Curated annotation (Swiss-Prot):
Repeat is among the record's keywords: yes
Subunit and interaction comment: Probably forms homo- or heterodimers. Interacts with DMBT1. Interacts with CD6 and ALCAM. Forms a complex with the ITGA3, ITGB1 and CSPG4. Interacts with LGALS3BP, LYPD3, ZFTRAF1 and UACA. Interacts with TRIM16; this interaction mediates autophagy of damage endomembranes. Interacts with cargo receptor TMED10; the interaction mediates the translocation from the cytoplasm into the ERGIC (endoplasmic reticulum-Golgi intermediate compartment) and thereby secretion.
Residues of the full protein shown: 113 to 250 of 250
Coiled coil (UniProt feature): none
Top-level taxonomic group: Eukaryota
UniProt keyword terms in alphabetical order: Acetylation, Cytoplasm, Differentiation, Disulfide bond, IgE-binding protein, Immunity, Innate immunity, Lectin, mRNA processing, mRNA splicing, Nucleus, Phosphoprotein, Repeat, Secreted, Spliceosome
Protein name: Galectin-3
A single GO molecular function term of this UniProt record: protein phosphatase binding
Chain span(s) of sequence motif Nuclear export signal: 114-129
Length: 138
């Protein structure tokens, strides 16, 4: 079991073909989950399931530059379930992060932060029990 919030260093930054896998279980009555791929203080890719935003479940994605959030990209397909185990896979492709949950494609997020090799840590936070956080090359 891993302590949340959890920092996963990404040595040498991300690169196309890098696959990050997060395994955990959503807490009962969860409100949020967040993955934050960081370039220093900037957040290149924030992936933020929200379980009750005005009585809707939505995934909010964004980038934070110089402490300012940009334009949100919202996905209404919501594969997380309170109380249940999940797998998030984030595949770095040349032009986007590609995210699958429980082996099903969920969304893509076009690279706004383009210095991929400088995106050198992943923060994992929110209302989960974190089981595993790892990476490999495919
Ligand atoms: O509610 C405050 C507002 O800035 C938005 O919430 C922020 O959204 C970020 C991503 O865009 C982060 O998730 C941050 O943690 C969160 O506070 C909010 O999403 C509004 O834009 C809704 O209209």
């Amino acid at each position: 079991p891993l302590i949340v919030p959890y920092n996963l260093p990404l040595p040498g930054g991300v690169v196309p073909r890098m696959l990050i896998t997060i395994l955990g279980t959503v807490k009962p009555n969860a409100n949020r989950i967040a993955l934050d791929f960081q370039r220093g203080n900037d957040v290149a890719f924030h992936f933020n399931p929200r379980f009750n935003e005005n009585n809707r479940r939505v995934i909010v994605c964004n980038t934070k530059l110089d402490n300012n959030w940009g334009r949100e990209e919202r996905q209404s397909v919501f594969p997380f379930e309170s109380g249940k185990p999940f797998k998030i896979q984030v595949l770095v492709e040349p032009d986007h992060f590609k995210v699958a949950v429980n082996d099903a494609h969920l969304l893509q997020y076009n690279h706004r932060v383009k210095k991929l090799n400088e995106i050198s840590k992943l923060g994992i936070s929110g209302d989960i029990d974190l089981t595993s956080a790892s990476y490999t090359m495919i």
